[PDB]
Every structure is written in structure tokens, then in C-alpha cells.
Write a protein that binds this ligand. Structure first.
Ligand SMILES: Nc1ncnc2c1ncn2[C@@H]1O[C@H](COP(=O)(O)OP(=O)(O)O)[C@@H](O)[C@H]1O
Ligand SMILES: [Mg+2]
Lengths: 584, 454, 446
């Protein structure tokens, strides 16, 4: 191919001639070392290149080679349970091969293993007309996840040759007779991270996702193919939420993305995820997870394409017919990487120094998520659920990153600093937060549970809102200025906050709560309210009720710790409440 | 003779440079054929000598300077018009996206359109019964008027949009509105809400829709209103239809315009928005009105969300300077469960003079228009101090005003998102909406209509 | 060979094989020898900046030779106890160090998955830090200060009192002064000698009137020495750098020399990368004995937390230590405000086996009581301060005793972790047992 020639090295900027055959946004290897660069400008045969590694020691005369493609990702068998960076460099392979704890400058390693032998099981017969998305076979990459080999986009013709066998991702497995002629296919396909993968049709996300987090699944639920934003101050619990969602969501595959990130904070995901095991399968969390781990030390191009690298992978398994959940922490540090490039490209700055296309980039990202009909004859359905953490300065959400995010998403989990200092976690503001899936979800819930669940959530929200109104009266006038009915509502609302909204992510049992356990728990909290309400109407006094319900209220608070196999020990509280209140 | 240049000189970011060209004009539309078969639309921003600086809609990412072709079409951005646009759903550039029979357009029209001669204009005076009393009485809409709705994120302006589309029509006439809807830079689920509503009500069978999404190119978001208006002026000034145009969100349009401006390295004006924002928006809203000797009309209802609920923001401010009035939606009303949450005090209509007394109501309720304005003002000043402090200055001259508000916002202004009321009903309820204020309080010129009904 | 001499810059023709940031040597017309560094290089020419300046240089009769190598550090175990330049040159009238080898000052990039959990406790001797914002081995815990705030003394107190308990094997302190005055520089160098802290420390002193290119090389010089002592000598290395604001300002000057358009707030666009490249040269590493712990110190311009320098730093470092002007005007030493301060790894270095089993609870107790006591004082000022709750009254006197006795310990007072925790109980003993967030089994410490 064509080999460029450096004519200028100025900081991170490198100029090179003999680049007439190059294209814009192409990834290049700059200098003798072959460090990573990207073409940003082009004039005749002089290309302007941004280098995202140290350019120290590089000068004119040294060669420059183009990879013939923009920033892409290798998609095939051997991608699951791998830890990449923003530009999809195999971090594990880097430590095993180079035998060092560092990232060698100018070291090129393939993302996937190109020597490993996978058994390809052909499932399609020859003479069949194939199009993009059509499944020609599969590979058992994990015990549960079936890696389905699909026809790459742009390929359309007749299947000539195909057979099952043990191949690498380089070996040809299928030959398609096209209009051009013969085209060989392999188990791997390339795709640019900045381009969204084609679909057959976009659908509405109406299926609720079980996260195990009570405050989330009950009051502010997100659907499969939905999008949620988690803004807040530092130390509010953004990351803990991202963790809890990643390891409990009823989803086929998880794509976690460090944007990002703090050095000693990235360590947590890397070490903790391979240590978690689903009791049903005996498999580790990583075995259904593709991790993108970026420290702040990583190249800015990798930090900027971090969420686009992840969602491209998420789209890949989405087309296969799986439900994928992609986590982003933190998008503010992704936007900061975007802001850095804006200044380096010397563009006209928008709001707060961010590029003027910030709102578009965020829109492009979230509109690539959702419930879709994947390409292919099967017309199968897949989804991508995007959950992103936002880290605004001082917790002020009137900043560009948050506002532009809330404009394209429907779920907003606002973190409150005053709540985090009360050890009230997750610190989600039940008054300020919202979910535009609430009505549709409650409809789904009522059907699958055969309960009046949607009325329970509504009443639950009504009590919390009445609490807010009453608390102002408790501040202006005395606490003894409320009627017994007002005193009861505050006690019921207190139970909702402490026994339900509050959820310890580090407790062995409280870390997760299934859909049925949430129902029974909310049932006994509301049951206490109803019975005590009726009791007051029958002449009973407020103090007499509380003094005689110490034991049963004690049993309510600990209901969050009741094991999932003993859900009847939560349902039995309903009877104890009635009998206890009836005695009074 | 088909023109195509295969050598690109320079690509700097989103901008391009093509040399050795001739006969290339300003604002000319171009096409770039990628090496993978992809075709991208572009626009000639500037021409010097044998050179042409152009901008590509989908960006210049992945473009070679030796293995690409740039076709110059010899015409600006156009729209394919026909008799069969009604019932169809189009792109931001006028391409079918509803998977029906593709239409063979009769002709192609410049989406910039042409400026109506102010002498040839026919001043709007035909009353439109929107059904909503807050609009119909106090901020009256007229056929040919440009009357926008100023709202905020989370507020039911989408519900108000669909409502008006359902029940608005001209009195004592068989004329039915042909609705041209234009979604601008909104999400899929936002766009799906309109697609669903238009199908259930059957409004799709009498409408043209131009759906532009949020992750569509910024240039396409800019082109969408001009695409819709070209279709509107076509159906009106060539088919004789009375077209009702509804656009949302105009805030997205302005943000797209700001992004494009910075990409062209133009110096930002006030609050970082372009200096030509007034002019640019004026090339859209002035497309409304009527013409002498020509049947049909064009009525616009722009919709925008005010950033941080600030009315002094460039987007609603410059909109207010151009359009003939505005309808304001506030959260303080919406929090009271009011739908629509219309605040009549910041609201206005500039063409309500000839619309009133002609279509309605011979000063029957045209006259009380300035009273409910002036009375609700003091009714709010009174309610402000009487709530936070003690006994009002007067329970007959100062707290009487408070009585005429609370219910006359929970009832007089309430209405309903799927509820339709006639003007007669509105002027009926209105005389009953003065509940309860004595004959001392109504300080108007007449004693006639104070006796006919309560 | 010299084509142009523009200010501190220089244009040299006939460059071939000249690399970026390569060192040059200038032989002037009078025989004076000066060195420089390539800031920008093309085919026909290269732009360099002379360390000693360009004043008095004749363009016609001067010669320039290229060394074919960038800035290097002569590393050795004999660095301990030595005070160096910003360029690594001896500044203490001692013998020249015989180098084990010469290293690049840019270092290498640590693999994100090659890191270990922060584990051990570092006793800074300061109660506001060790207890409420604990420093952990491998952590990046910065100090956010302002113009006129005593971050100088705080840097001196930390570098003097910092120790590892109990394992005292190969602990060293690398100190880096960046673009500061001679007074502040002399204060540090004198304090290290008088206290004997010099015997286990390495210093790299860069002054304000040193060229901007030397100021930029200073953090890279110190961190290279640190990672040498850490990785190759298995030492527990603590790195302290101040002022980091001077570093960011130095970048602006070089960026303007290369005629680069300034980014947000006047700083180069690649500011984020540069700070991260420096700060992330820390943390425990899998399969390595020694480690690097960093305490970057910076002054926030106009005390603005939204300024690029402290804002970007927070996105890189695990927390921050805030110095406020209010506490300084009150006479609090150190003026650490514990409410906006944070350490994200503190739990990893406390508990049992490290510090004491009552560390975490009293921390949450002192924090909650100080916040509530701070709020009760506000009500007192606006209300009568006479009818306030009897329990609230104690909270106000607690918050006062917490700032004047606990936080205000002095700049030359060293507190062991036990002495810090014991004093915390004497403060918590002001309130009744019914107002605590500690467990009932914490009645062994009363
Ligand atoms: N669900 C939870 N259960 C228990 N502790 C929590 C929970 N969420 C947050 N925390 C505590 O709050 C702190 C905030 O952690 P992190 O998520 O990193 O904050 P942020 O990401 O908001 O800066 C953690 O150290 C953790 O101890
Ligand atoms: Mg976090």
C-alpha cells in the first residue's frame, strides 16, 4: 500500500505527505514506533494527523501507514469476557504477551484471538438466498450465550459452500455468490464505532427491566430498550447504581464502559466482576459481560469513543436477538474528552467550552439504543438498554451534559446530596425524579402479577408527596400541631423511606430484591397504613397504636432481609398487622 | 448535461473544497458517492473562481479525495410535490418513510419559496374556533395568522398540539383544515406518539407529515420546516386548500442552527446564537397568510420549549418579535392540574381586532376581552398578598377579585386535552365564569349584556 | 545554522533526524555554551527554546549541535538525601551521582487492569486527614488551596510527619516544587534538613523565574525518580507536587510559542491529557513490591472550584482536600474544611488490623454531629439563641470545639492515629449516648 512521510511534528499534531490515497478519519500508525494517530484534515497529499500518544522522539522522515479504515471493532467469537479500552485494545493480552504491567508505546495487538479454534456449527443449507443479518450458523462461546454468525452488511447473494468445522476467526467458513462474484466470509466482521448498525424496524420499549433495586423497579422503572440518566454530586452513589444494575439486570449481555475514569476506581470493576457468580449457572459475571475499561491516562480518542465502542458491541449482540444492557460511567468524563478534542481541533466552542455538536453526539448515542427488529429473515427482536451516570459540577444539573441527556431519555434518577449524608441509599429524590415508562410498566405489572400493583405504586407516591407537604407544617408549627391522621401518614411515609426506598447494596440479601418480594414488601407497608387508618376512625388513639405495634413494625423493617425462598414470611405480616390492630 | 467532479482538493473538518469547477452556483445542491456505495447530500456554501466550498449533511467522515465523486445537481434543495402527499409520511428532506407507494412528483420546488408581495397579501380576519376559550376569547386565532405556543420541558404542549389539530375549524363554512405536521429533531418515541395519535383519530388521512429525528443530520433539521412550508404553500396556493401548519420543536431547530453556524466558524451573537436567528426564523414564519385572488390560506402554529423557563432567551424572544402573538404555558398552572395550563397574562394575539366582532360576537364577548385582562391582573395582585398575608384590604373591592380567579382557572381556563367546547359554549360558560362578582365589579361600557344573561 | 532568534525561541536550519523534544547545544560567538529543547520540527527547520535564554546571541557567528536524545534522568539509589534542580541537576553542593542508567522522563502508561486495591494506611499525623479523609497507599489525594492560603505549611507538615505504621520498609518521599518563589523553595529545603526528613527524601526544586520548559519537565523528572525507586527498588514512595497551577500556566506559554489556539479559559485543549498523564503515574501494581502515592497540590484561581485546573483534577484523583479562606481568617491550622473534602478510598485503609476498630463509626459520628452542630449555630444567630433546644445547644459548642481543638491542631503538631481517635471520643462525650450513630458495642471507648 501507500506509505506516508512525516514533514512536521508539532506537539500532538503530525503532518505527513505521500498520503493521497488516505481518507478522512482513518486510523494511522505514526513514525517508526507506529503510535496511534488519526487523520483530521487533508490537502492534496498532505494529511493532518492527531496523535493520541506521546510524540516525543518522533520527527520528519519517519513513515506513516494508514490502516485503511476508521476506528472500528473486531466482532466475532472471543469477545465475551474480555476487557478492552476505548480503541478496543486487549488489556489482558497486553499483560500476558508483553509480560509487563504497562502499555507499550506503539505496540499493536489484535482485539480477539486469531489463533484460537472455535467449533462452527453451520445451520443453513446451500442454495439459500441470504441478506444482511441472516444467521448462517453459531458458536458455543459460553455455556449459555450462543454466538450466532451473521451475514455482514453489504453482502447479498446465494450460499454456495458451507460446512461445520473447527476454524479460527481468520479461516473462511462460507462462500456467497454475489453479483460481483465469489465472496468469502469469516466468523469475524469489522464495524466503525461512529456508525450505527442497520436495523429492520425500531420499536417501542414496553417490557420493564428487573433491576432488584426497589426504588427503581417500583417508582421509576426503565424498560428493555429504554434509557436512564443518573446525575448527582460526588459520593452520591452514581457508580454503586451502575454496579448494581450491571450484575442483577434480567439481561442477556452487559457492556460496561469506563469513560473515563479514576485509576483506583477502575480497579473495582476489573476485580469484583470476575468474582461474582450466578447461583443458577455457576458462571462468572464476566462470562456475559464485555468490559470497556478506560483510565484518565488513556488516549483521548479512546476516551471519546468509549461509549461508541461499547454500544457498537451492544448492537452486535442486539442483532443476534439478545437483550443487552450498556452502562456508562461517567458520561461527564466522556464529554470532557469530547471537549478536549474540540479545543485540540481548534473549533468554535459552544456552551461552557463544549463543542457545538455536543447535543447531537448524545442524541446519536441514545438513539442507537432501543427495542428493534434485527435484520434477517427471522425478524427477531433485540434491545439495548442504556444506563448512564452523569457527573455535573457541584450537582447542578443545569449544565449542558445533563440537560442534553434528559432531552433524549425518559428516565431520570436524580441523586440528592442531603440524602447521601443520611445514609439514605440509593440517594434518589423521590419528588424530583421521574419515569415516562411508569404508566406502561404498571400495565405490564398488573397483567403478569394479576394484582392491583399500579394502584399500590400510585398510593405509595401519594403518601410520599403528602409527607413533603406535611413536613413544612412540622417546621412552621409544632409536630403536635398535626391531627392523628396526619401523624399516621408521616409514620407510613417514614416506613416507605426506611423499609423500602433505602437499600444497602453491600448486604448479602438486601443487594437484590425480585419482583415478587417487592410486591409483598410494599403490600405489608400499605397494609399497616390501611388498618391504622381504619383504627383511628373507630376511636383509637395514635399513641396507643404505636405503643402496641412495636413488635410488628420491627418485623416490617427487617422484611428487606428475608431470603428469596421464604417470601411467605413477608406475606404473613399482613395477618399479624390486622390481628394486632384489631386487638387495639 | 450531468456534472461530476472526481478530484477533491481539500477537506477540513465538515468543510470541503473542490477545484477546477465552472457553472457552479451559490446554495447549489450536491451529492457525494462514497466508495462503499453510500450517497451523501451536500450544499455549496461559497464559490470563488474555479473553486467551491461545500458542506456535507452527514459529515465528511471516511471521504477520500481521489476515490470519490462530487455530482453538482445544478439546483438548490428542492421538494417533490404532488396531489398524493396527503396521507403520507415524509423525511426531513421530503423522502417517503411510511413504506407506501412512492409518488412521481409533478415538479420540484425551491424549499426557500418566494416572498409574498405585501400588496398582494390578504390580511387575515376569518375567526378560527379552536375550542379553547383561553385562546378563542382572549388570544383569538385567525386563518393565515402565525401564532406559536411557548412551553417548557415536561409541559403538555404535545397534548395541546394534538387538541388544536382535532377541534379547530372555521365558522359558518364547509372548509376543513389540511394539516401539515413537522416534527423537528425529536426522539423516536416522541415521533411515535404523533404517528400513533394521527392514526387513531384518523387525522393521518387528511394530513402530510414531515418527520425529522434527533439523530438526523443537523442540516436536515434545518431543512425540515422549509420542506413542510413548501408543501403547505403548494397545497394552499395551487390546490386552494386552507393549510394548518404545526411545527415542534423550534428550540431544536435553533440549536441545530447554532451547531451549523459554529461548524462554518461564524462568530456567535447574543448568548452564543447566530446573528441571523431573527432573519432565519423570519423566513419561516412569514410564509403564512393569504393572497388576493387566490383561494386557500396558510396558518402556522410553531411550538417551542423555553430554556430554563426563561422568556428572555433568544429563541422565544426573537420568536415573539416575529410572530403575531404567543401562547404561554406555565408550570405553576400545570402543577394545579390545569390542562391546558395557559397563562393569559403573558399571552397575546395581534390579529384579534378584525377577528372579533365579525365572526364573533358583535361585541357580545369581544368587549369583555379587555376586562378579563385587566380584572385578572388585579385579581392576581390581590391573591398574591392575601395568601401570604392576612385579611385583604377589602372583601368587596380587593378579596372579591380573589374569588374570580381560583375557580376561573380551575374551570374557566381548564378545559381538556381530549375535550372540545364551542365558542358559544365558551361565551356561555364565560358569563357564568364570572363567579362570583357583582354588577359593581363589571366596569364595562355596556349594561345590555349584563342583564341578558347572569 | 541558526536562522532566526525570536524572543526565547530559535529557528535552526539544516535539521535532519531531529526529533521532537530533542535537546540541543548552542556554542555562542563568545564561547558561552547553552542548551535547549525542540518544541517543533519540520523538514527544513526546527523551533527550539534555550534554557538559559537567547539574550546576547549573535545570529551570524553562533553554532548549534543536536544531541540526538531528549531530557534524561541519571537514576541511582544515591538519590536519597539529595536535592536536585528541575532538570535533575545537583542543587546542594554535593558529589555528582554515578548513574545506574539514564531514563526517559515521560515514563510508561499503566494498564488499567494491572492495578491492585489500595490497601495500607498512611499516617499524615493530621486529624482532619487520617480520620475523615484517610490517605491510602497508591491513592491520589490532592489538596485544593488558594492565593494566600497556608498550603505551604501543610505541604511541609505532611512531608515531615508522614509515616507508614507499622511496616517501615523502604518508605521514601519525593518532593517536587514547580515554579515557586525562592522563599517558598528555601523554606522546604531548610525544613527537610533541620528535621532530618532529608535523610529519606528526594527533592526536585524548580523556581518561578526558571524557563517555562523547565517548569514542565519538573513533574516528569520527579515522577520518573519515584517510579524508579518504586518499581526497581521496591520502595513505598509518596510524591508531593506544588504548585500544579504553575504547571498549567507554563503549558499556556509553550502552546502560544507553537501558535496553538487556546481552549477553555485560556488553557491548551490537551490540558486534561497532561494532568492525567502525570497523576495516573501512581497506584499499587499487581506483581510489584513498591508503589507510588501522590499528593498533588494546587491553588484554585479566584477560589473557583469550576476552574479547569481543580475541575479536571477531581475527575482524575480519588477525592480532594479543601483549604478555605474562612478557616484561615479564623486562625484554624490547618484550615481544612471537612465538608467539601473527600477521600474515595478511606475505607480501604481503616478498620481493624489498620488504625483501630472504632475508626469508621466515630468518623461518621463526628461528621454528622459537626454538620448538625454547624447548622444549629445558624439558627442561634437568626433566632434568640436563648430558647434553642438544650440538646442543640451542646451541638453548637461541639462544632466550635471540633474546629478549634480538633481541626486546629497546628502546623508542627504530630498526632498518632490513636491520639486522634481518643480526642474524637472526648468530643463525642459532650453529647448524650442517645444521640450517636455508633453501635452499642462501642461502649468500650465510651
Ligand atoms: N446502595 C448503596 N448501599 C450502600 N452504600 C452506598 C450505596 N450507594 C452508595 N453508597 C456509598 O456512597 C459512596 C458513593 O460511592 P460512588 O457511587 O462512587 O459515589 P459517586 O459515584 O456518586 O461519586 C460509596 O462509597 C458507598 O459507600
Ligand atoms: Mg462515581
Amino acid at each position: 500500500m501507500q506509505i506516508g512521510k512525516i514533514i512536521k511534528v508539532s506537539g500532538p499534531l503530525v503532518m505527513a505527505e505521500n498520503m493521497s490515497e488516505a481518507c478522512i478519519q482513518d486510523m494511522c500508525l505514526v513514525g517508526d514506533l507506529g503510535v496511534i494517530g488519526e487523520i483530521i484534515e487533508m490537502r492534496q497529499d498532505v494529511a493532518s494527523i492527531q496523535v493520541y500518544e506521546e510524540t516525543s522522539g518522533i520527527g520528519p522522515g519517519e513513515p506513516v501507514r494508514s490502516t485503511g479504515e476508521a476506528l472500528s471493532v473486531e466482532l466475532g467469537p472471543g469477545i465475551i469476557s474480555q476487557m478492552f479500552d476505548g480503541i478496543q485494545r486487549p488489556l489482558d493480552t497486553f499483560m500476558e504477551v508483553t509480560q509487563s504491567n504497562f502499555l507499550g508505546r506503539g505496540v499493536q495487538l489484535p482485539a480477539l484471538d486469531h489463533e484460537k479454534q472455535w467449533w462452527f456449527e453451520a445451520t443453513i443449507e446451500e442454495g439459500t438466498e441470504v441478506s444482511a443479518g441472516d444467521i448462517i450458523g453459531y458458536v458455543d462461546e459460553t455455556k449459555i450465550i450462543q454466538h450466532k454468525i451473521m451475514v455482514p452488511n453489504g453482502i447479498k447473494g446465494t450460499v454456495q459452500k458451507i460446512e461445520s468445522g473447527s476454524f479460527t476467526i481468520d479461516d473462511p467458513i462460507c462462500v456467497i455468490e454475489t453479483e460481483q462474484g465469489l465472496k468469502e466470509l469469516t466468523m469475524m466482521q469489522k464495524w466503525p464505532v461512529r456508525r450505527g448498525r442497520p436495523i429492520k424496524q425500531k420499536l417501542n420499549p414496553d417490557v420493564p427491566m428487573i433491576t432488584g433495586q426497589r426504588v427503581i423497579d417500583t417508582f421509576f422503572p426503565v424498560t428493555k430498550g429504554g434509557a436512564a440518566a443518573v446525575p448527582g454530586p460526588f459520593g452520591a452513589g452514581k457508580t454503586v447504581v451502575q454496579h448494581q444494575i450491571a450484575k442483577w439486570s434480567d439481561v442477556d449481555l452487559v457492556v460496561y464502559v469506563g469513560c473515563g475514569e479514576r485509576g483506583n476506581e477502575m480497579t473495582d470493576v476489573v476485580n469484583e466482576f470476575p468474582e461474582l457468580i450466578d447461583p443458577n449457572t455457576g458462571e462468572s459475571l464476566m462470562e456475559r459481560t464485555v468490559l470497556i475499561a478506560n483510565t484518565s491516562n488513556m488516549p483521548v480518542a479512546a476516551r471519546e469513543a468509549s461509549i461508541y465502542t461499547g454500544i457498537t458491541i451492544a448492537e452486535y449482540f442486539r442483532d443476534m436477538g439478545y437483550d443487552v444492557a450498556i452502562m456508562a460511567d461517567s458520561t461527564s468524563r466522556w464529554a470532557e474528552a469530547l471537549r478536549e478534542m474540540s479545543g485540540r481541533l481548534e473549533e468554535m466552542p459552544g456552551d461552557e467550552g463544549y463543542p457545538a455538536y455536543l447535543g447531537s453526539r448524545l442524541a446519536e448515542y441514545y438513539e442507537r439504543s432501543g427495542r428493534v427488529i434485527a435484520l434477517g429473515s427471522d425478524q427477531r427482536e433485540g434491545s439495548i438498554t442504556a444506563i448512564s451516570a452523569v457527573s455535573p459540577s457541584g450537582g447542578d444539573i443545569s449544565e449542558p451534559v445533563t440537560q442534553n441527556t434528559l432531552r433524549v431519555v425518559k428516565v431520570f434518577w436524580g441523586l440528592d446530596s442531603s440524602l447521601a449524608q443520611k445514609r439514605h441509599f440509593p440517594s434518589i429524590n423521590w419528588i424530583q425524579s421521574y419515569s415516562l415508562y411508569s404508566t406502561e410498566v404498571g400495565r405490564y405489572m398488573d397483567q403478569i402479577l394479576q394484582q392491583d400493583w399500579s394502584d399500590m405504586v400510585t398510593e405509595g407516591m401519594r403518601i410520599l408527596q403528602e409527607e413533603e407537604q406535611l413536613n413544612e407544617i412540622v417546621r412552621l408549627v409544632g409536630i403536635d400541631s398535626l391531627s392523628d391522621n396526619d401523624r399516621l401518614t408521616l409514620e407510613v411515609a417514614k416506613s416507605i423511606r426506611e423499609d423500602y426506598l433505602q437499600q444497602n447494596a453491600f448486604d448479602d440479601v438486601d443487594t437484590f430484591t425480585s419482583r415478587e418480594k417487592q410486591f409483598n414488601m410494599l403490600k405489608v407497608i400499605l397494609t399497616f397504613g390501611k388498618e391504622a387508618r381504619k383504627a383511628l376512625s373507630l376511636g383509637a388513639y395514635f399513641n396507643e397504636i404505636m405503643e402496641g405495634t412495636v413488635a410488628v413494625r420491627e418485623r416490617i423493617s427487617r422484611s428487606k432481609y428475608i431470603p428469596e425462598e421464604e417470601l411467605a414470611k413477608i406475606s404473613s405480616i399482613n395477618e399479624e398487622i390486622k390481628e394486632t390492630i384489631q386487638l387495639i | 448535461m450531468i456534472k461530476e467532479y472526481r478530484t477533491i482538493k481539500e477537506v477540513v473538518g465538515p468543510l470541503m473544497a473542490v477545484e477546477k469547477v465552472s457553472g457552479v452556483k451559490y446554495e447549489e445542491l450536491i451529492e457525494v458517492r462514497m466508495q462503499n456505495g453510500e450517497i451523501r447530500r451536500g450544499q455549496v456554501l461559497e464559490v470563488q473562481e474555479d473553486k467551491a466550498m461545500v458542506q456535507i449533511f452527514e459529515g465528511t467522515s471516511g471521504i477520500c479525495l481521489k476515490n470519490s465523486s462530487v455530482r453538482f445537481l445544478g439546483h438548490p434543495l428542492q421538494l417533490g410535490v404532488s396531489e398524493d402527499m396527503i396521507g403520507r409520511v415524509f423525511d426531513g428532506l421530503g423522502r417517503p418513510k411510511d413504506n407506501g407507494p412512492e409518488i412521481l412528483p409533478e415538479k420540484y420546488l425551491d424549499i426557500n419559496g418566494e416572498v409574498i408581495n405585501p400588496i398582494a397579501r390578504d390580511y387575515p380576519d376569518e375567526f378560527i374556533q379552536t375550542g379553547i376559550s383561553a385562546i378563542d376569547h382572549l388570544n383569538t386565532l385567525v386563518r393565515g395568522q402565525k401564532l406559536p405556543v411557548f412551553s417548557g420541558s415536561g409541559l403538555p404542549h404535545k397534548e395541546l398540539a394534538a387538541q388544536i389539530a382535532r377541534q379547530a375549524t372555521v365558522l359558518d363554512s364547509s372548509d376543513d383544515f389540511a394539516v401539515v405536521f413537522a416534527a423537528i429533531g425529536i426522539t423516536f418515541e416522541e415521533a411515535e406518539f404523533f404517528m400513533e395519535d394521527f392514526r387513531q383519530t384518523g387525522a393521518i388521512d387528511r394530513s402530510v407529515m414531515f418527520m425529522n429525528l434527533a439523530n438526523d443530520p443537523a442540516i436536515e433539521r434545518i431543512a425540515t420546516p422549509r420542506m413542510a412550508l413548501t408543501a403547505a404553500e403548494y397545497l394552499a396556493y395551487e390546490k386552494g386548500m386552507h393549510v394548518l401548519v404545526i411545527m415542534t420543536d423550534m428550540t431544536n431547530y435553533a440549536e441545530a442552527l447554532r451547531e451549523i453556524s459554529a461548524a462554518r466558524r461564524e462568530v456567535p451573537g447574543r448568548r452564543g446564537y447566530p446573528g441571523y436567528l431573527y432573519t432565519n426564523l423570519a423566513t419561516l414564519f412569514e410564509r403564512a397568510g393569504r393572497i388576493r385572488g387566490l383561494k386557500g390560506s396558510v396558518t402556522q402554529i410553531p411550538i417551542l420549549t423555553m430554556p430554563e423557563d426563561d422568556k428572555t432567551h433568544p429563541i422565544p424572544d426573537l420568536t415573539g418579535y416575529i410572530t403575531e402573538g404567543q401562547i404561554i404555558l406555565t408550570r405553576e398552572l400545570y402543577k394545579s392540574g390545569i390542562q391546558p395550563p395557559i397563562d393569559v397574562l403573558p399571552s397575546l394575539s395581534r390579529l384579534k381586532d378584525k377577528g372579533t366582532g365579525a365572526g364573533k360576537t358583535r361585541e357580545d364577548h369581544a368587549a369583555t376581552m379587555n376586562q378579563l385582562f385587566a380584572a385578572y391582573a388585579q385579581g392576581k395582585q390581590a391573591k398574591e398578598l392575601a395568601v401570604v398575608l392576612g385579611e385583604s384590604a377589602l372583601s368587596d373591592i380587593d378579596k372579591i377579585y380573589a374569588k374570580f380567579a381560583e375557580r376561573f382557572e380551575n374551570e374557566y381556563v381548564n378545559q381538556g386535552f381530549y375535550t372540545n367546547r364551542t365558542i358559544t359554549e365558551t361565551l356561555d360558560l364565560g358569563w357564568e365564569l364570572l363567579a362570583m362578582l357583582p354588577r359593581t365589579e363589571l366596569k364595562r361600557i355596556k349594561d345590555d349584556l349584563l342583564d341578558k344573561y347572569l
